[PDB]
């Protein structure tokens, strides 16, 4: 009873594109690769704006990038997150080394921790250290400044992400039925406590945006991303390619730790789940792993091209998963049109990434977890293929760290396959269920997680 499962369904009678009427306001609702690709790339700019859904206004004091309508103040708020999603890694040699290090310094973290937990034959929930895990690499990067597993009170920040899914999740019901907010029921609850959960995170955050300020004497170089966009717009200021003002700052970098803690959490908890739910890719991915870089060294990111495999399962995971299946719903800028259907300006639009990855004349085993899916007759990754998973979106509002979040879990489960063990509780039959919302988080799942050799990670 999730939203992406029933546009499919409605699309079969209907068509690819449809339009379903959620409460009032009027859904197009894209379904093809050839709806899609149409209408975000070749019609592209005309669906690159935002609802006018005001729960949107809640996120980062309004002046998120995320969830704001496309304009000009808003191509140099994307252009200069992009600029700087892009610059950070890679403006000199090692760039991604201090990324890279995060992840490793990391990944051993985990699995010292994963391992903690699960001594015994024990089984635990792998989800508050991985989301402890993932977000210290983003505040390392943004902020300087990772944090303990022991820390209460960054727990608590990362432990209202099952809200922030539901309230904006394409399928909801907080924007479009507004008559809702005036009594006791599911769709009260779910909003105030949204409300609530974005306050949390625009004041952890201007909260780094005061003492970051306080801290860069302007003979200084930024030591930070959040830095690096106060040298940005202080350089905007007292003088003049992507630079903000300094007031989007703080909703700008909101958005890029916001959204990666949470997905890159998703998608680390995914792969996992495909490990212990899959045990024979595990054992291929773990397999591969060992050959191609060896026992004697633990893997880092050189190794991408010839790892074969653990791409060919990162894209399965990802298209099986389709862990984001509807794109934060996006809107038009002016008149258009899809398969012939006439789509008026400021309709409200969704883009139903669960069927690119699961129209069964484009991916035979469709719900079949298959890996090797992605892999040619020599047996090499086959770029043709591996390119038409749709999960990070495309055209004007496709996702900006696609580029870093591929980079984060390839490392993350390098790292994790090549030096644990993970087993699934064989004491939990009723299958894996999930939490929809904006995200497919698995509800509890129980895991043992044993070290292949010895601690290889202490630096
Ligand atoms: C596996 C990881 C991730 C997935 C699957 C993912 C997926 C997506 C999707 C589906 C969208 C919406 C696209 C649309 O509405 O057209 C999006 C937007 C966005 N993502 Fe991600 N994302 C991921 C990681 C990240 C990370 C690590 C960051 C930090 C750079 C990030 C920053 C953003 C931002 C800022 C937007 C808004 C872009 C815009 O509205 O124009 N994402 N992402
Ligand atoms: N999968 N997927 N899609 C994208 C993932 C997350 C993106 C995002 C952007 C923000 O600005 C933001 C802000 C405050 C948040 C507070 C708690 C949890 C999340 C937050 C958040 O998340 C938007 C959609």
Not at 438 to 455: A, G, Q, Y
Request: proline share 6%; glycine share 6%.
């Amino acid at each position: 009873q999730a939203a992406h499962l029933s546009f499919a369904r409605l699309a079969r009678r209907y068509g690819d594109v449809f339009q379903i009427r959620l409460g009032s306001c009027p859904i197009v609702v894209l379904n093809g690769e050839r709806a899609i690709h149409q209408a975000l790339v070749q019609q592209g700019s005309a669906f690159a704006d935002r609802p006018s859904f005001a729960s949107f206004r809640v996120v980062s004091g309004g002046r998120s990038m995320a969830f704001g309508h496309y304009s000009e103040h808003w191509k140099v708020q994307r252009r200069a997150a992009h600029s700087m999603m892009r610059n950070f890694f890679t403006r000199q040699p090692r760039s991604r080394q201090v990324l890279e290090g995060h992840v490793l310094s990391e990944a051993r973290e985990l699995v010292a921790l994963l391992v903690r937990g699960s001594a015994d034959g024990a089984f635990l929930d792998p989800r508050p250290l991985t989301v402890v895990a993932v977000a210290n690499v983003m505040s390392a990067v943004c902020f300087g400044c990772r944090y303990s597993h022991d820390d209460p009170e960054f727990r608590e920040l990362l432990s209202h992400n099952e809200e922030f899914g539901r309230t904006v999740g394409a399928g909801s019901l907080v924007d479009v039925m507004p008559w809702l907010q005036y009594f006791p029921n599911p769709v009260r609850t779910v909003f105030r406590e949204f409300e609530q959960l974005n306050r949390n995170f625009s004041n952890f955050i201007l909260d780094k945006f005061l003492r970051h300020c306080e801290s860069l004497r302007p003979g200084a170089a930024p030591r930070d991303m959040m830095d690096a966009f106060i040298l940005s717009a202080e350089k905007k200021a007292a003088g003049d390619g992507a630079r903000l003002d300094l007031e989007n700052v703080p909703a700008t970098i909101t958005d890029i730790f916001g959204a990666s803690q949470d997905t890159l959490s998703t998608a680390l908890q995914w792969l996992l789940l495909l490990f212990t739910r899959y045990p024979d890719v595990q054992t291929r991915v773990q397999a591969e792993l060992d050959q191609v870089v060896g026992r004697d060294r633990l893997p880092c990111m050189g190794d991408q091209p010839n790892l074969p495999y653990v791409l060919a399962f990162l894209y399965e995971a990802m298209r099986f998963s389709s862990f984001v299946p509807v794109t934060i719903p996006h809107a038009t800028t002016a008149n258009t049109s899809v398969l012939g259907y006439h789509i008026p300006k400021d309709t409200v639009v969704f883009v139903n990434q669960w069927s690119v990855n699961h129209d069964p004349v484009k991916w035979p085993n469709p719900e079949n977890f298959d890996p090797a899916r992605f892999l040619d007759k020599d047996g090499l990754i086959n770029k043709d293929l591996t390119s038409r998973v749709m999960i990070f979106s495309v055209g004007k509002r496709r996702c900006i760290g696609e580029e870093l979040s591929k980079m984060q879990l390839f490392l993350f489960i390098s790292i994790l396959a090549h030096q644990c063990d993970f087993r699934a509780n064989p004491n939990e039959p009723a299958k894996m269920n999930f939490s929809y919302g904006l995200t497919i988080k698995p509800k509890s799942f129980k895991v043992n997680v044993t070290l292949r050799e010895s601690m290889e990670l202490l630096d």
